[PDB]
Design a protein around this nucleic acid. Sequence first.
DNA 1: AAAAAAAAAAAAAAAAAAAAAAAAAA
DNA 2: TTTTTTTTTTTTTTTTTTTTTTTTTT
Lengths: 658, 495
Amino acid sequence: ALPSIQLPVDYNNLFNEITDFLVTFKQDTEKGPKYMAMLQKVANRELNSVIIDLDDILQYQNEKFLQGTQADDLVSAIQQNANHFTELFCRAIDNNMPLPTKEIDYKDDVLDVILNQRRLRNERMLFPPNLTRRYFLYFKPLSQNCARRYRKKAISSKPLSVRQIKGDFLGQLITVRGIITRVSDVKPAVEVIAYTCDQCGYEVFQEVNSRTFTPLSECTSEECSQNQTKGQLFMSTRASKFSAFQECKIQELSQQVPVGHIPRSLNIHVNGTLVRSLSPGDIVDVTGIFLPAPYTGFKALKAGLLTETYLEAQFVRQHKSLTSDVEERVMELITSGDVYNRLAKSIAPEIYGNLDVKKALLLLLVGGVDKRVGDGMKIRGDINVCLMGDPGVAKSQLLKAICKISPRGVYTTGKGSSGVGLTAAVMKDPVTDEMILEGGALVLADNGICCIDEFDKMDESDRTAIHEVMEQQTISISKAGINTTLNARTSILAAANPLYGRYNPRLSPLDNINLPAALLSRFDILFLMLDIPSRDDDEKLAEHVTYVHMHNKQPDLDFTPVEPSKMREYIAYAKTKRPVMSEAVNDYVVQAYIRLRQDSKREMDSKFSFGQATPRTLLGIIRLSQALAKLRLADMVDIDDVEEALRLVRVSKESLYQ
Amino acid sequence: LRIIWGTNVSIQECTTNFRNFLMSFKYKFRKILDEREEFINNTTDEELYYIKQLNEMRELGTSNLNLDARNLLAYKQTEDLYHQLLNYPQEVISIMDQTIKDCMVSLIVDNNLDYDLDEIETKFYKVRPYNVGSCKGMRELNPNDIDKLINLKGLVLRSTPVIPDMKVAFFKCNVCDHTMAVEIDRGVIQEPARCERIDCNEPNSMSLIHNRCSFADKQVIKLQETPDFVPDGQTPHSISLCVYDELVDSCRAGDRIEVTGTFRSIPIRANSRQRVLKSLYKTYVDVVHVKKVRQITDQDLAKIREVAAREDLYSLLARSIAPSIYELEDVKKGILLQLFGGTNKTFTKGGRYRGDINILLCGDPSTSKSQILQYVHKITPRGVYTSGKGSSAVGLTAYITRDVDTKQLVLESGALVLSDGGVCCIDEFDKMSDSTRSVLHEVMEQQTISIAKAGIITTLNARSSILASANPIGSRYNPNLPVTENIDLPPPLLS
DNA sequence: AAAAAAAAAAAAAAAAAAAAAAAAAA
DNA sequence: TTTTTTTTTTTTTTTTTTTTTTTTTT
Ligand SMILES: Nc1ncnc2c1ncn2[C@@H]1O[C@H](COP(=O)(O)OP(=O)(O)OP(=O)(O)O)[C@@H](O)[C@H]1O
Ligand SMILES: Nc1ncnc2c1ncn2[C@@H]1O[C@H](COP(=O)(O)OP(=O)(O)O)[C@@H](O)[C@H]1O
Ligand SMILES: [Mg+2]
Ligand SMILES: [Zn+2]
Ligand SMILES: [Zn+2]
């Protein structure tokens, strides 16, 4: 039949030592046992989880070694095998559960009502213990610090990868380092199922220890022993115990993959209060038990002796507001002074020059006023900045760098992927094969910045969305029978590449690029950065570039790089602020606009300028004054603010020659 | 005294508390409850809000209630039901309907009138509670609140046709032809063993008559999590909703609704043939109340007449349609005249004569024509605002397309057919393709569109009005050159 | 009670090759 | 003007394997 083998481990002495450790253990550094305190805390319907530390277990072993009596190295037994010690510890907790000391508080708990109703009828006229349980038991991996303090080495907490997980580590407690890619919704998994039986005896309980089960559907009680055909069992959800279950996939980091290989993936299962600890896009260190999946059902026959695997998770270690602190940070930065120039300069300190562009990127980072006028009129406060110019002028570092500053931002590129206009209504998700409404990148960045690199090569299909956003900021959705309009208020940062190379003495700016005049008119600001050879500038550029290669540090200079978290804190605080205008300030704007138009009537010339001024220019003047006012000022806007905005616009306009 | 098994709810006290609540409650107790200051007590304290609705329902005969949770908590003694309903919705609602059964009698015989009450006896009543508790999204739902009333919010994606549900089986005997009806409980049909007729009494002589049973209606709805509450780098989640009886065919596709209902979870089978089930349930909600996000009265007629008696009706609605637009009064005059349209006639001999006005706006590129079109879009009852930049060549007319959910054929009308009897606004008229332009030609000439594809040959009705806006080539419309060169439009289409 | 027979369980899908249209230009 | 260019549009499932678990049938 089944042969027998002798193994050193005996579970009786282990159970005795667990019972001794629960009572005796004290924190050496409230007084008394460490865990009977938290058990009493649990009994008062406040704590939902019990977490054991193997450092503490080593402390009990060290205490016993100080006494000198032999031990059973419980820490090694837990590491080698952990699926059984969970049940052992659960039984040990159940045996020594303290009484409720205060605030019994039975209000509307359905399971409580069922259990209380059971008592009267059972006594007047044995169930699975897990039904009465509420706490969840988790283990905590070892610490190298405590290990090095008492040697003994450590295996459970070592940050292995997905690839270093061999088949020799199955059934042990290990830790894996990786990035979370997919997380699923929370669903209930049955643990104890209760069947109601046509007022025959009473409801019956069955435990489920697999992913698949069979209903009972036959009443075996003493009163139900009567021979007449009477009916099968019906399930009752209220008297049954469920649990929260979640499954995730972790993927190997790019640094740890060897050359020529493809990264692998691992599956993680989490049950209990630990659910929702992991989200997509997080680099974490997850500890758990590595167990074999049954792989049954279809396609099991072909494998024969091949199994799946998964990791039952028990611990999570993620690697990486209005308060007086941030109230004082802004005051400190105000007392620092030179906020405008320093804020513009610290943006991408590697790149030397293009300081006006850095001023304009700051105004794009902040947003103008979005005022909802009555009778349906709306006015946009978002910023549309396009940066044109010859190749090899740092076109595509500037952009990427701006994406770092604001959390709400997406870097979308040319026809390699379609994300600008992918407001599709069909999503063939493999998990369920049903449609999901999937928004595009333009919709994704709300109150944010969309960085569209290589805008020249992008197709007219995305041009439709770009045209519509600047008009109404509300994306109409695909024609898959939903008729949905989605909010898409966003600011646009575009990078352009002139047609066939560099700037051309062809006079029309429309000839330099493919973009239509109407599309360019909606842009708030246009910047031309042409590469003109000058003997002085090349020397400083070469020196600046080569200093970075010689020493990895950027070239030290009197200019001080402000700390980036301060950048974010000031930018957010400015964004929260709401300006206001006065009647006197806007009167000078009319004079400015009429002077600009009287210039534009004669400004039509062979080479310089793009068409003529439009009322959209007046709108953008106020829109840009918004950000310059939000930068440091409040309440009414200064008159010199309009001068600053006009100066920035005029420099951008004069960039056509330069 | 006796309590329904499992729960702690007893009918005896609940019925009395509810009748006390209904005959006792007023806005007085409600405004004492909320007491948020600046609370009006101007004769509202004695209005008897529940009794007046009860009487108006009795005289109308409709059965719809809007019982609220805060109002239910307002009364001190009935405060128990507030926490007794969240945990046991079904039994409390069963008591609800049973008490409303005699709520009619409690008021019909106060003056001993001659109401029949027999049609009241036959008809049944129910309730639609709302605002049960704090609204929480589907992203936060644990197994800890199964079979408890919740309030959810989400986007409607799709609906399914009516689903039959058996209520009363019907078995006939193939020998003696005897008919008997067997009720079904929770889906399972208890088969008749042998014919009840003692004389017939034959084993295994039963036949099911499918079309002689009794059925009820079901509908299933699909929801999606709203984009506002979703965090970064996530995919929206979905929930299925069960709708029964009068609420079927209420939620249109693409709307955003807040619903109240009972959370539930059921098992689904592992193997289709075997009895075996798998240890992971599916979660859904059974809904009880749904909320979203002609027949003009005589007073409206009188005010319409007196306003129509204004000295200058032309200029007033000239300025009303586009409040933001300054000057450009003449184009507003034309649009106001267009929105009414001349009379339409179709006499037998000559045929139909058109009664729609078509308007084309064009000129320098940075005027405000698009805002004008979006203004006239809203005023008109039925109309469509779609640009002519691209899309399918028959995107404004019928386009036979394969159905996505089912591998079937669906005939989908376009934007010109969907603007029948109204004003259809076209934007960016100059970018419309040479092949689709001809379609508009048959629309503006015969007002009908014919489709002949996939074995389908048919004609639809356009009968709409075209308001279009265009842009020239260049940054200005120089008056010296005539219209034709600048607008890039065929002479007949402009004509 | 112990045999012989009979189905469920599929699932899946991108990646490439050939042919006819509906827009571009020496 | 007749040349080159261009999108693009179905093309897909007919097969598999030996266990494992069910109903009939001496
Ligand atoms: N002002 C500058 N300061 C520092 N580096 C600069 C500057 N201008 C250009 N560079 C150099 O240009 C490169 C960054 O821009 P890069 O040429 O890679 O992309 P791009 O400007 O988008 O051009 P392309 O059209 O080739 O993609 C780096 O090698 C960088 O050193
Ligand atoms: N007569 C006007 N009255 C009010 N606003 C105007 C007027 N002319 C131009 N504008 C402004 O100019 C912008 C015009 O944009 P719009 O006309 O929608 O673009 P398009 O030229 O594509 O139709 C609007 O934002 C509007 O505020
Ligand atoms: Mg680049
Ligand atoms: Zn029984
Ligand atoms: Zn019979």
